[PDB]
Amino acid sequence: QTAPEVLRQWQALAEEVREHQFRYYVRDAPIISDAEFDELLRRLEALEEQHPELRTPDSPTQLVGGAGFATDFEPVDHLERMLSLDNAFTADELAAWAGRIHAEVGDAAHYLCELKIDGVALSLVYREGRLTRASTRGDGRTGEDVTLNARTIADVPERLTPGDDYPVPEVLEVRGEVFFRLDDFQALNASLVEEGKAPFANPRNSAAGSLRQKDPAVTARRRLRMICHGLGHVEGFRPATLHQAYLALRAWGLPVSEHTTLATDLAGVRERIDYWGEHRHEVDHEIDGVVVKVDEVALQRRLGSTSRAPRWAIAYKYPPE
């Protein structure tokens, strides 16, 4: 239990102290039981300065008093590129939008149809089962860091749940779209109008704003529902198709309510991309359209991805009203 081990206890325990602080503090959701927590630092405290050559303003003990944890949107690069998506206003457009595969695919590779969850996108980088950072779309190459706020979000699990035929990838950069359910938004607003701020025009904002809070507390108080919708850069997984990845993410704890529909032929999707109109309002979310996606990754690969969006996933868009 020498110095080399000292650390294998020192920092090895700090990461657990602030871990709970944050939890208990700005977030108001304790994992352990006050006795336990109060028992860790106490150990770390004395047996910290007990090693003066291991104490600093960064020590969760003699520093992590009340605050300390605060977001500050610090420009951080991404990992993949996180592009946007083309668009299809007219149906006969979709024809080509995917019919472009008429090139290499044999017009058969399985197209995935998803719901367009209008909202503020966020990327999650799970370095080894745990959440490392959390950036925004930004310029696509580098985005703002809202880790804390993201962590405070419900659906986002600070730790991955291993198991199944899927092993926890040593990274998994997952893309998703944090948003607000109509009502939850209609409440937040209603519980305002001003007396401090003003009502939000559209939820996209209600969310964004919420998630864009410097004081995680505000973000932690606010509802918000993330929905990890697309895989990104990974290193320990590499599956055959989008959904096969979804099944894996699910077994991991990430939110995947992609009302998908593993389709085939332009017909299979033509309907679902025509059914989500007269029946596309029962959703607690806010879908503006649908987006088809060549399912088999083995095809998106042999399929380019321009500097504006992929070449393998148009996004049907149903015009407002």
PDB file of C-alpha atoms in Angstrom:
ATOM      1  CA  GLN A   1       0.000   0.000   0.000  1.00  0.00           C
ATOM      2  CA  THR A   2       2.850   2.352  -0.939  1.00  0.00           C
ATOM      3  CA  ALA A   3       2.622   5.631  -2.887  1.00  0.00           C
ATOM      4  CA  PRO A   4       1.842   3.825  -6.166  1.00  0.00           C
ATOM      5  CA  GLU A   5      -1.024   2.359  -4.146  1.00  0.00           C
ATOM      6  CA  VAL A   6      -1.597   5.667  -2.359  1.00  0.00           C
ATOM      7  CA  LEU A   7      -3.053   6.957  -5.613  1.00  0.00           C
ATOM      8  CA  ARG A   8      -4.866   3.651  -6.073  1.00  0.00           C
ATOM      9  CA  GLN A   9      -6.969   4.979  -3.207  1.00  0.00           C
ATOM     10  CA  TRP A  10      -6.367   8.717  -3.277  1.00  0.00           C
ATOM     11  CA  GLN A  11      -7.697   9.829  -6.657  1.00  0.00           C
ATOM     12  CA  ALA A  12      -9.199   6.346  -6.585  1.00  0.00           C
ATOM     13  CA  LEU A  13     -11.645   7.622  -3.965  1.00  0.00           C
ATOM     14  CA  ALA A  14     -11.947  11.279  -4.911  1.00  0.00           C
ATOM     15  CA  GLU A  15     -13.674  10.204  -8.126  1.00  0.00           C
ATOM     16  CA  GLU A  16     -16.305   8.728  -5.809  1.00  0.00           C
ATOM     17  CA  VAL A  17     -16.559  11.644  -3.400  1.00  0.00           C
ATOM     18  CA  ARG A  18     -17.353  14.330  -5.991  1.00  0.00           C
ATOM     19  CA  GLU A  19     -19.278  11.560  -7.747  1.00  0.00           C
ATOM     20  CA  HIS A  20     -21.823  11.572  -4.916  1.00  0.00           C
ATOM     21  CA  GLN A  21     -21.445  15.261  -4.067  1.00  0.00           C
ATOM     22  CA  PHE A  22     -22.690  16.188  -7.524  1.00  0.00           C
ATOM     23  CA  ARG A  23     -25.387  13.541  -7.074  1.00  0.00           C
ATOM     24  CA  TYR A  24     -26.471  14.750  -3.645  1.00  0.00           C
ATOM     25  CA  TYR A  25     -25.825  18.379  -4.536  1.00  0.00           C
ATOM     26  CA  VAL A  26     -26.860  20.014  -7.811  1.00  0.00           C
ATOM     27  CA  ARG A  27     -29.088  17.157  -9.003  1.00  0.00           C
ATOM     28  CA  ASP A  28     -30.818  16.172  -5.746  1.00  0.00           C
ATOM     29  CA  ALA A  29     -30.667  12.384  -6.114  1.00  0.00           C
ATOM     30  CA  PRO A  30     -28.454  10.396  -3.701  1.00  0.00           C
ATOM     31  CA  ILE A  31     -27.099   6.978  -4.597  1.00  0.00           C
ATOM     32  CA  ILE A  32     -25.774   5.795  -1.232  1.00  0.00           C
ATOM     33  CA  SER A  33     -26.983   6.875   2.231  1.00  0.00           C
ATOM     34  CA  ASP A  34     -25.745  10.090   3.923  1.00  0.00           C
ATOM     35  CA  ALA A  35     -23.923   8.001   6.525  1.00  0.00           C
ATOM     36  CA  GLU A  36     -21.880   6.303   3.804  1.00  0.00           C
ATOM     37  CA  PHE A  37     -21.011   9.543   1.982  1.00  0.00           C
ATOM     38  CA  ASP A  38     -20.104  11.304   5.231  1.00  0.00           C
ATOM     39  CA  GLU A  39     -17.882   8.270   5.882  1.00  0.00           C
ATOM     40  CA  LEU A  40     -15.849   8.490   2.669  1.00  0.00           C
ATOM     41  CA  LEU A  41     -14.493  12.030   2.772  1.00  0.00           C
ATOM     42  CA  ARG A  42     -13.919  11.652   6.520  1.00  0.00           C
ATOM     43  CA  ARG A  43     -11.554   8.856   5.518  1.00  0.00           C
ATOM     44  CA  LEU A  44     -10.191  10.823   2.580  1.00  0.00           C
ATOM     45  CA  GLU A  45      -9.892  14.028   4.612  1.00  0.00           C
ATOM     46  CA  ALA A  46      -7.381  13.238   7.355  1.00  0.00           C
ATOM     47  CA  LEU A  47      -5.723  10.535   5.270  1.00  0.00           C
ATOM     48  CA  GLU A  48      -5.354  13.129   2.518  1.00  0.00           C
ATOM     49  CA  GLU A  49      -3.325  15.858   4.167  1.00  0.00           C
ATOM     50  CA  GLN A  50      -1.838  12.791   5.860  1.00  0.00           C
ATOM     51  CA  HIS A  51       0.001  12.937   2.542  1.00  0.00           C
ATOM     52  CA  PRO A  52       0.535  16.709   2.070  1.00  0.00           C
ATOM     53  CA  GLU A  53       2.350  15.942  -1.171  1.00  0.00           C
ATOM     54  CA  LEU A  54      -1.121  15.039  -2.432  1.00  0.00           C
ATOM     55  CA  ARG A  55      -3.431  17.946  -1.566  1.00  0.00           C
ATOM     56  CA  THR A  56      -4.635  20.830  -3.715  1.00  0.00           C
ATOM     57  CA  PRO A  57      -7.472  23.250  -4.588  1.00  0.00           C
ATOM     58  CA  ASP A  58      -8.637  20.412  -6.825  1.00  0.00           C
ATOM     59  CA  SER A  59      -8.997  18.053  -3.881  1.00  0.00           C
ATOM     60  CA  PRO A  60     -12.715  17.271  -3.510  1.00  0.00           C
ATOM     61  CA  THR A  61     -12.082  17.486   0.226  1.00  0.00           C
ATOM     62  CA  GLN A  62     -10.520  20.847   1.111  1.00  0.00           C
ATOM     63  CA  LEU A  63     -12.299  22.526  -1.797  1.00  0.00           C
ATOM     64  CA  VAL A  64     -15.402  20.633  -2.837  1.00  0.00           C
ATOM     65  CA  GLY A  65     -17.519  22.336  -0.210  1.00  0.00           C
ATOM     66  CA  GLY A  66     -20.819  23.599  -1.544  1.00  0.00           C
ATOM     67  CA  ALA A  67     -20.335  24.515  -5.199  1.00  0.00           C
ATOM     68  CA  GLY A  68     -17.409  23.984  -7.549  1.00  0.00           C
ATOM     69  CA  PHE A  69     -19.423  22.017 -10.099  1.00  0.00           C
ATOM     70  CA  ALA A  70     -20.527  24.363 -12.879  1.00  0.00           C
ATOM     71  CA  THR A  71     -20.944  24.243 -16.675  1.00  0.00           C
ATOM     72  CA  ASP A  72     -19.091  26.765 -18.848  1.00  0.00           C
ATOM     73  CA  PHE A  73     -19.576  25.642 -22.462  1.00  0.00           C
ATOM     74  CA  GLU A  74     -15.900  25.187 -23.260  1.00  0.00           C
ATOM     75  CA  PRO A  75     -15.228  24.648 -27.003  1.00  0.00           C
ATOM     76  CA  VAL A  76     -14.453  20.926 -27.374  1.00  0.00           C
ATOM     77  CA  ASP A  77     -13.780  18.952 -30.555  1.00  0.00           C
ATOM     78  CA  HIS A  78     -15.846  15.838 -31.302  1.00  0.00           C
ATOM     79  CA  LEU A  79     -14.684  12.446 -32.612  1.00  0.00           C
ATOM     80  CA  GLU A  80     -16.609  11.512 -35.771  1.00  0.00           C
ATOM     81  CA  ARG A  81     -17.816  14.654 -37.554  1.00  0.00           C
ATOM     82  CA  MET A  82     -21.495  14.670 -36.614  1.00  0.00           C
ATOM     83  CA  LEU A  83     -23.107  15.806 -39.868  1.00  0.00           C
ATOM     84  CA  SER A  84     -26.638  16.995 -40.580  1.00  0.00           C
ATOM     85  CA  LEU A  85     -29.144  15.318 -42.886  1.00  0.00           C
ATOM     86  CA  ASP A  86     -30.538  15.946 -46.360  1.00  0.00           C
ATOM     87  CA  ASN A  87     -34.245  16.625 -46.681  1.00  0.00           C
ATOM     88  CA  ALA A  88     -37.290  15.516 -48.675  1.00  0.00           C
ATOM     89  CA  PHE A  89     -40.299  17.830 -48.895  1.00  0.00           C
ATOM     90  CA  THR A  90     -41.851  16.023 -51.861  1.00  0.00           C
ATOM     91  CA  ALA A  91     -42.486  12.267 -51.883  1.00  0.00           C
ATOM     92  CA  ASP A  92     -41.289  11.753 -55.459  1.00  0.00           C
ATOM     93  CA  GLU A  93     -38.063  13.197 -54.072  1.00  0.00           C
ATOM     94  CA  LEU A  94     -37.619  10.279 -51.692  1.00  0.00           C
ATOM     95  CA  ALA A  95     -37.736   8.101 -54.810  1.00  0.00           C
ATOM     96  CA  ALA A  96     -34.203   9.184 -55.598  1.00  0.00           C
ATOM     97  CA  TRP A  97     -33.320  10.118 -51.986  1.00  0.00           C
ATOM     98  CA  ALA A  98     -32.759   6.400 -51.453  1.00  0.00           C
ATOM     99  CA  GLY A  99     -33.223   5.200 -55.011  1.00  0.00           C
ATOM    100  CA  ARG A 100     -29.696   6.578 -55.405  1.00  0.00           C
ATOM    101  CA  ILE A 101     -28.683   3.198 -54.028  1.00  0.00           C
ATOM    102  CA  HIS A 102     -29.820   2.067 -57.478  1.00  0.00           C
ATOM    103  CA  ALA A 103     -26.098   2.475 -57.870  1.00  0.00           C
ATOM    104  CA  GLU A 104     -24.493  -0.057 -55.542  1.00  0.00           C
ATOM    105  CA  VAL A 105     -26.802  -2.118 -53.360  1.00  0.00           C
ATOM    106  CA  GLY A 106     -29.188  -3.859 -55.695  1.00  0.00           C
ATOM    107  CA  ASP A 107     -31.884  -1.624 -54.244  1.00  0.00           C
ATOM    108  CA  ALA A 108     -31.770  -3.998 -51.289  1.00  0.00           C
ATOM    109  CA  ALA A 109     -29.917  -3.378 -48.029  1.00  0.00           C
ATOM    110  CA  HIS A 110     -32.837  -2.715 -45.686  1.00  0.00           C
ATOM    111  CA  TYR A 111     -33.922   0.856 -45.080  1.00  0.00           C
ATOM    112  CA  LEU A 112     -34.641   2.014 -41.531  1.00  0.00           C
ATOM    113  CA  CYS A 113     -37.463   4.530 -41.079  1.00  0.00           C
ATOM    114  CA  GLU A 114     -37.285   6.741 -38.011  1.00  0.00           C
ATOM    115  CA  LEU A 115     -39.219   9.533 -36.360  1.00  0.00           C
ATOM    116  CA  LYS A 116     -37.768  13.022 -36.634  1.00  0.00           C
ATOM    117  CA  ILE A 117     -37.567  14.161 -33.010  1.00  0.00           C
ATOM    118  CA  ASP A 118     -37.403  17.955 -33.428  1.00  0.00           C
ATOM    119  CA  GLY A 119     -35.018  19.209 -30.762  1.00  0.00           C
ATOM    120  CA  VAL A 120     -31.525  20.019 -29.502  1.00  0.00           C
ATOM    121  CA  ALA A 121     -29.007  17.308 -30.427  1.00  0.00           C
ATOM    122  CA  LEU A 122     -26.220  16.200 -28.063  1.00  0.00           C
ATOM    123  CA  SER A 123     -23.352  13.704 -28.424  1.00  0.00           C
ATOM    124  CA  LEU A 124     -22.315  11.299 -25.649  1.00  0.00           C
ATOM    125  CA  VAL A 125     -18.819   9.828 -25.346  1.00  0.00           C
ATOM    126  CA  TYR A 126     -18.799   6.877 -22.960  1.00  0.00           C
ATOM    127  CA  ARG A 127     -15.120   6.311 -22.267  1.00  0.00           C
ATOM    128  CA  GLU A 128     -15.111   2.789 -20.817  1.00  0.00           C
ATOM    129  CA  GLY A 129     -18.664   2.242 -19.597  1.00  0.00           C
ATOM    130  CA  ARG A 130     -18.690   5.714 -18.033  1.00  0.00           C
ATOM    131  CA  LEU A 131     -19.578   9.141 -19.448  1.00  0.00           C
ATOM    132  CA  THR A 132     -16.473  11.181 -20.310  1.00  0.00           C
ATOM    133  CA  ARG A 133     -17.764  14.379 -21.927  1.00  0.00           C
ATOM    134  CA  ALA A 134     -20.893  15.689 -23.658  1.00  0.00           C
ATOM    135  CA  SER A 135     -20.625  18.170 -26.517  1.00  0.00           C
ATOM    136  CA  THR A 136     -23.189  19.943 -28.692  1.00  0.00           C
ATOM    137  CA  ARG A 137     -23.494  19.716 -32.473  1.00  0.00           C
ATOM    138  CA  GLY A 138     -21.655  23.002 -32.860  1.00  0.00           C
ATOM    139  CA  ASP A 139     -19.800  23.523 -36.124  1.00  0.00           C
ATOM    140  CA  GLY A 140     -19.933  19.752 -36.435  1.00  0.00           C
ATOM    141  CA  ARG A 141     -16.154  19.523 -35.987  1.00  0.00           C
ATOM    142  CA  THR A 142     -16.110  20.906 -32.432  1.00  0.00           C
ATOM    143  CA  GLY A 143     -18.928  21.691 -29.992  1.00  0.00           C
ATOM    144  CA  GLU A 144     -19.814  23.123 -26.563  1.00  0.00           C
ATOM    145  CA  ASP A 145     -19.371  20.953 -23.482  1.00  0.00           C
ATOM    146  CA  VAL A 146     -22.520  20.442 -21.433  1.00  0.00           C
ATOM    147  CA  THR A 147     -21.344  17.326 -19.618  1.00  0.00           C
ATOM    148  CA  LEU A 148     -22.771  18.224 -16.210  1.00  0.00           C
ATOM    149  CA  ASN A 149     -26.110  19.321 -17.650  1.00  0.00           C
ATOM    150  CA  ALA A 150     -26.221  16.180 -19.776  1.00  0.00           C
ATOM    151  CA  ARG A 151     -25.281  14.033 -16.785  1.00  0.00           C
ATOM    152  CA  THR A 152     -28.098  15.655 -14.824  1.00  0.00           C
ATOM    153  CA  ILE A 153     -30.536  14.586 -17.547  1.00  0.00           C
ATOM    154  CA  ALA A 154     -32.618  11.532 -16.688  1.00  0.00           C
ATOM    155  CA  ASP A 155     -32.422   9.068 -19.595  1.00  0.00           C
ATOM    156  CA  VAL A 156     -28.651   9.650 -19.780  1.00  0.00           C
ATOM    157  CA  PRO A 157     -26.936   7.058 -17.519  1.00  0.00           C
ATOM    158  CA  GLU A 158     -23.542   8.124 -16.139  1.00  0.00           C
ATOM    159  CA  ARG A 159     -22.650   4.441 -16.295  1.00  0.00           C
ATOM    160  CA  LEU A 160     -23.275   1.705 -18.865  1.00  0.00           C
ATOM    161  CA  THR A 161     -24.968  -1.576 -17.900  1.00  0.00           C
ATOM    162  CA  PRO A 162     -22.936  -4.499 -19.365  1.00  0.00           C
ATOM    163  CA  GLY A 163     -24.516  -7.811 -20.297  1.00  0.00           C
ATOM    164  CA  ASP A 164     -26.098  -9.809 -23.125  1.00  0.00           C
ATOM    165  CA  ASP A 165     -24.207 -10.721 -26.301  1.00  0.00           C
ATOM    166  CA  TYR A 166     -22.909  -7.150 -26.224  1.00  0.00           C
ATOM    167  CA  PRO A 167     -19.746  -6.144 -24.316  1.00  0.00           C
ATOM    168  CA  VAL A 168     -19.437  -2.567 -23.047  1.00  0.00           C
ATOM    169  CA  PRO A 169     -17.550  -0.773 -25.855  1.00  0.00           C
ATOM    170  CA  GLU A 170     -14.456   1.053 -24.624  1.00  0.00           C
ATOM    171  CA  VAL A 171     -15.922   4.318 -25.968  1.00  0.00           C
ATOM    172  CA  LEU A 172     -19.228   4.400 -27.831  1.00  0.00           C
ATOM    173  CA  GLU A 173     -19.844   7.936 -29.076  1.00  0.00           C
ATOM    174  CA  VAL A 174     -23.628   7.996 -29.247  1.00  0.00           C
ATOM    175  CA  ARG A 175     -25.712  10.704 -30.897  1.00  0.00           C
ATOM    176  CA  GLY A 176     -29.193  11.621 -29.655  1.00  0.00           C
ATOM    177  CA  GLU A 177     -31.731  14.468 -29.497  1.00  0.00           C
ATOM    178  CA  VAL A 178     -32.615  15.832 -26.048  1.00  0.00           C
ATOM    179  CA  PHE A 179     -36.064  17.413 -26.015  1.00  0.00           C
ATOM    180  CA  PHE A 180     -39.233  18.228 -24.109  1.00  0.00           C
ATOM    181  CA  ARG A 181     -42.591  16.482 -24.046  1.00  0.00           C
ATOM    182  CA  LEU A 182     -45.379  18.924 -24.966  1.00  0.00           C
ATOM    183  CA  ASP A 183     -46.979  18.957 -21.503  1.00  0.00           C
ATOM    184  CA  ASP A 184     -43.750  19.024 -19.506  1.00  0.00           C
ATOM    185  CA  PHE A 185     -42.938  22.079 -21.607  1.00  0.00           C
ATOM    186  CA  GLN A 186     -46.443  23.502 -21.174  1.00  0.00           C
ATOM    187  CA  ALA A 187     -45.857  23.201 -17.437  1.00  0.00           C
ATOM    188  CA  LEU A 188     -42.402  24.738 -17.262  1.00  0.00           C
ATOM    189  CA  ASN A 189     -43.677  27.687 -19.259  1.00  0.00           C
ATOM    190  CA  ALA A 190     -46.962  28.011 -17.356  1.00  0.00           C
ATOM    191  CA  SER A 191     -44.789  28.015 -14.238  1.00  0.00           C
ATOM    192  CA  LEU A 192     -43.221  31.222 -15.485  1.00  0.00           C
ATOM    193  CA  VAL A 193     -44.556  33.672 -18.072  1.00  0.00           C
ATOM    194  CA  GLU A 194     -41.959  35.980 -16.499  1.00  0.00           C
ATOM    195  CA  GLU A 195     -41.393  36.539 -12.748  1.00  0.00           C
ATOM    196  CA  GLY A 196     -37.748  35.994 -13.572  1.00  0.00           C
ATOM    197  CA  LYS A 197     -37.788  35.105 -17.273  1.00  0.00           C
ATOM    198  CA  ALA A 198     -40.462  34.789 -19.978  1.00  0.00           C
ATOM    199  CA  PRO A 199     -42.364  31.998 -21.709  1.00  0.00           C
ATOM    200  CA  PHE A 200     -40.482  30.024 -24.336  1.00  0.00           C
ATOM    201  CA  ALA A 201     -41.798  30.289 -27.876  1.00  0.00           C
ATOM    202  CA  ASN A 202     -41.218  26.693 -29.047  1.00  0.00           C
ATOM    203  CA  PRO A 203     -40.020  23.678 -27.001  1.00  0.00           C
ATOM    204  CA  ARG A 204     -36.894  23.303 -29.165  1.00  0.00           C
ATOM    205  CA  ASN A 205     -35.999  26.386 -27.163  1.00  0.00           C
ATOM    206  CA  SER A 206     -37.539  25.285 -23.862  1.00  0.00           C
ATOM    207  CA  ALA A 207     -35.123  22.372 -24.129  1.00  0.00           C
ATOM    208  CA  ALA A 208     -32.020  24.007 -25.604  1.00  0.00           C
ATOM    209  CA  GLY A 209     -32.287  26.784 -23.058  1.00  0.00           C
ATOM    210  CA  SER A 210     -32.798  24.282 -20.254  1.00  0.00           C
ATOM    211  CA  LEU A 211     -29.869  22.125 -21.322  1.00  0.00           C
ATOM    212  CA  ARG A 212     -27.833  25.287 -21.969  1.00  0.00           C
ATOM    213  CA  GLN A 213     -27.708  26.272 -18.292  1.00  0.00           C
ATOM    214  CA  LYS A 214     -24.377  27.304 -16.764  1.00  0.00           C
ATOM    215  CA  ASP A 215     -25.644  26.202 -13.340  1.00  0.00           C
ATOM    216  CA  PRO A 216     -26.405  22.486 -13.784  1.00  0.00           C
ATOM    217  CA  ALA A 217     -28.954  22.965 -10.988  1.00  0.00           C
ATOM    218  CA  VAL A 218     -31.310  24.673 -13.428  1.00  0.00           C
ATOM    219  CA  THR A 219     -30.705  21.926 -15.971  1.00  0.00           C
ATOM    220  CA  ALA A 220     -31.090  19.303 -13.239  1.00  0.00           C
ATOM    221  CA  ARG A 221     -34.404  20.763 -12.112  1.00  0.00           C
ATOM    222  CA  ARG A 222     -35.755  20.808 -15.677  1.00  0.00           C
ATOM    223  CA  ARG A 223     -37.265  17.596 -17.115  1.00  0.00           C
ATOM    224  CA  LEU A 224     -35.805  16.937 -20.577  1.00  0.00           C
ATOM    225  CA  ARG A 225     -35.756  13.549 -22.267  1.00  0.00           C
ATOM    226  CA  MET A 226     -32.712  12.444 -24.281  1.00  0.00           C
ATOM    227  CA  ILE A 227     -33.069   9.661 -26.844  1.00  0.00           C
ATOM    228  CA  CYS A 228     -29.682   8.366 -28.116  1.00  0.00           C
ATOM    229  CA  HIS A 229     -30.768   8.063 -31.782  1.00  0.00           C
ATOM    230  CA  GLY A 230     -27.603   7.380 -33.764  1.00  0.00           C
ATOM    231  CA  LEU A 231     -24.331   5.549 -33.219  1.00  0.00           C
ATOM    232  CA  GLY A 232     -21.057   7.394 -33.794  1.00  0.00           C
ATOM    233  CA  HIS A 233     -17.370   6.582 -33.461  1.00  0.00           C
ATOM    234  CA  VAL A 234     -16.853   3.374 -31.481  1.00  0.00           C
ATOM    235  CA  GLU A 235     -13.973   1.121 -30.420  1.00  0.00           C
ATOM    236  CA  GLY A 236     -15.046  -2.279 -29.128  1.00  0.00           C
ATOM    237  CA  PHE A 237     -18.298  -2.915 -30.946  1.00  0.00           C
ATOM    238  CA  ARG A 238     -18.701  -2.463 -34.701  1.00  0.00           C
ATOM    239  CA  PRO A 239     -22.045  -4.199 -35.485  1.00  0.00           C
ATOM    240  CA  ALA A 240     -23.578  -5.223 -38.822  1.00  0.00           C
ATOM    241  CA  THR A 241     -26.505  -2.750 -38.915  1.00  0.00           C
ATOM    242  CA  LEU A 242     -28.138   0.259 -37.301  1.00  0.00           C
ATOM    243  CA  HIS A 243     -30.806  -1.652 -35.383  1.00  0.00           C
ATOM    244  CA  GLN A 244     -28.507  -4.470 -34.316  1.00  0.00           C
ATOM    245  CA  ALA A 245     -26.779  -1.550 -32.642  1.00  0.00           C
ATOM    246  CA  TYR A 246     -30.039  -0.304 -31.194  1.00  0.00           C
ATOM    247  CA  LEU A 247     -30.682  -3.667 -29.576  1.00  0.00           C
ATOM    248  CA  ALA A 248     -27.183  -3.282 -28.086  1.00  0.00           C
ATOM    249  CA  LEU A 249     -27.658   0.303 -26.902  1.00  0.00           C
ATOM    250  CA  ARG A 250     -30.930  -0.728 -25.261  1.00  0.00           C
ATOM    251  CA  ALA A 251     -29.180  -3.518 -23.361  1.00  0.00           C
ATOM    252  CA  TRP A 252     -26.797  -0.746 -22.337  1.00  0.00           C
ATOM    253  CA  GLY A 253     -29.340   1.649 -20.850  1.00  0.00           C
ATOM    254  CA  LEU A 254     -29.417   4.372 -23.485  1.00  0.00           C
ATOM    255  CA  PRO A 255     -32.808   5.679 -24.681  1.00  0.00           C
ATOM    256  CA  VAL A 256     -33.876   4.302 -28.063  1.00  0.00           C
ATOM    257  CA  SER A 257     -37.538   5.027 -28.744  1.00  0.00           C
ATOM    258  CA  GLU A 258     -36.974   5.080 -32.491  1.00  0.00           C
ATOM    259  CA  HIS A 259     -40.416   3.924 -33.639  1.00  0.00           C
ATOM    260  CA  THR A 260     -38.372   2.163 -36.337  1.00  0.00           C
ATOM    261  CA  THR A 261     -39.849  -0.098 -39.001  1.00  0.00           C
ATOM    262  CA  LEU A 262     -37.109  -2.197 -40.677  1.00  0.00           C
ATOM    263  CA  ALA A 263     -38.478  -1.699 -44.181  1.00  0.00           C
ATOM    264  CA  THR A 264     -37.819  -3.152 -47.644  1.00  0.00           C
ATOM    265  CA  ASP A 265     -38.533  -1.756 -51.124  1.00  0.00           C
ATOM    266  CA  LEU A 266     -39.633   1.843 -51.650  1.00  0.00           C
ATOM    267  CA  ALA A 267     -43.118   0.604 -50.769  1.00  0.00           C
ATOM    268  CA  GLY A 268     -42.374  -0.517 -47.227  1.00  0.00           C
ATOM    269  CA  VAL A 269     -41.293   3.017 -46.317  1.00  0.00           C
ATOM    270  CA  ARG A 270     -43.577   4.915 -48.677  1.00  0.00           C
ATOM    271  CA  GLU A 271     -46.400   3.881 -46.348  1.00  0.00           C
ATOM    272  CA  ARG A 272     -44.813   4.582 -42.962  1.00  0.00           C
ATOM    273  CA  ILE A 273     -43.606   7.860 -44.478  1.00  0.00           C
ATOM    274  CA  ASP A 274     -47.274   8.494 -45.230  1.00  0.00           C
ATOM    275  CA  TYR A 275     -48.809   6.979 -42.097  1.00  0.00           C
ATOM    276  CA  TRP A 276     -47.069   9.461 -39.832  1.00  0.00           C
ATOM    277  CA  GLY A 277     -49.409  12.261 -40.808  1.00  0.00           C
ATOM    278  CA  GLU A 278     -52.999  11.437 -39.944  1.00  0.00           C
ATOM    279  CA  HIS A 279     -51.661   9.435 -36.999  1.00  0.00           C
ATOM    280  CA  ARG A 280     -48.491  11.353 -36.118  1.00  0.00           C
ATOM    281  CA  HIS A 281     -49.811  13.368 -33.151  1.00  0.00           C
ATOM    282  CA  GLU A 282     -50.323  10.709 -30.479  1.00  0.00           C
ATOM    283  CA  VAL A 283     -46.597  11.022 -29.705  1.00  0.00           C
ATOM    284  CA  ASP A 284     -45.493  12.677 -26.456  1.00  0.00           C
ATOM    285  CA  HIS A 285     -42.475  13.883 -28.431  1.00  0.00           C
ATOM    286  CA  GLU A 286     -42.535  16.326 -31.385  1.00  0.00           C
ATOM    287  CA  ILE A 287     -41.738  14.691 -34.730  1.00  0.00           C
ATOM    288  CA  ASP A 288     -41.551  16.976 -37.772  1.00  0.00           C
ATOM    289  CA  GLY A 289     -40.950  14.198 -40.268  1.00  0.00           C
ATOM    290  CA  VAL A 290     -39.347  10.819 -40.889  1.00  0.00           C
ATOM    291  CA  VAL A 291     -35.870   9.780 -41.954  1.00  0.00           C
ATOM    292  CA  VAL A 292     -34.998   6.595 -43.882  1.00  0.00           C
ATOM    293  CA  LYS A 293     -31.610   4.974 -43.248  1.00  0.00           C
ATOM    294  CA  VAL A 294     -29.767   2.224 -45.119  1.00  0.00           C
ATOM    295  CA  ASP A 295     -29.773  -0.289 -42.260  1.00  0.00           C
ATOM    296  CA  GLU A 296     -26.752  -2.486 -42.994  1.00  0.00           C
ATOM    297  CA  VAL A 297     -23.660  -0.541 -41.937  1.00  0.00           C
ATOM    298  CA  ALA A 298     -21.884  -2.691 -44.533  1.00  0.00           C
ATOM    299  CA  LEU A 299     -23.590  -0.402 -47.038  1.00  0.00           C
ATOM    300  CA  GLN A 300     -23.268   3.059 -45.514  1.00  0.00           C
ATOM    301  CA  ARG A 301     -19.554   2.297 -45.601  1.00  0.00           C
ATOM    302  CA  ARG A 302     -19.520   1.586 -49.339  1.00  0.00           C
ATOM    303  CA  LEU A 303     -21.569   4.782 -49.447  1.00  0.00           C
ATOM    304  CA  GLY A 304     -20.110   8.272 -49.260  1.00  0.00           C
ATOM    305  CA  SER A 305     -20.889  10.934 -46.670  1.00  0.00           C
ATOM    306  CA  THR A 306     -20.542  14.468 -48.056  1.00  0.00           C
ATOM    307  CA  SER A 307     -19.283  17.380 -45.964  1.00  0.00           C
ATOM    308  CA  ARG A 308     -22.902  18.362 -45.340  1.00  0.00           C
ATOM    309  CA  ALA A 309     -24.626  15.074 -44.508  1.00  0.00           C
ATOM    310  CA  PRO A 310     -24.469  11.328 -45.269  1.00  0.00           C
ATOM    311  CA  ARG A 311     -25.216   9.873 -48.711  1.00  0.00           C
ATOM    312  CA  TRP A 312     -27.200   7.037 -47.145  1.00  0.00           C
ATOM    313  CA  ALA A 313     -30.110   8.521 -45.179  1.00  0.00           C
ATOM    314  CA  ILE A 314     -32.501  11.128 -46.557  1.00  0.00           C
ATOM    315  CA  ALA A 315     -34.943  12.666 -44.099  1.00  0.00           C
ATOM    316  CA  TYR A 316     -38.553  13.055 -45.178  1.00  0.00           C
ATOM    317  CA  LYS A 317     -40.085  16.268 -43.855  1.00  0.00           C
ATOM    318  CA  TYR A 318     -43.829  16.850 -43.480  1.00  0.00           C
ATOM    319  CA  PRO A 319     -44.645  20.584 -44.047  1.00  0.00           C
ATOM    320  CA  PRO A 320     -46.160  22.354 -40.965  1.00  0.00           C
ATOM    321  CA  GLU A 321     -49.756  23.575 -41.389  1.00  0.00           C
TER     322      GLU A 321
END
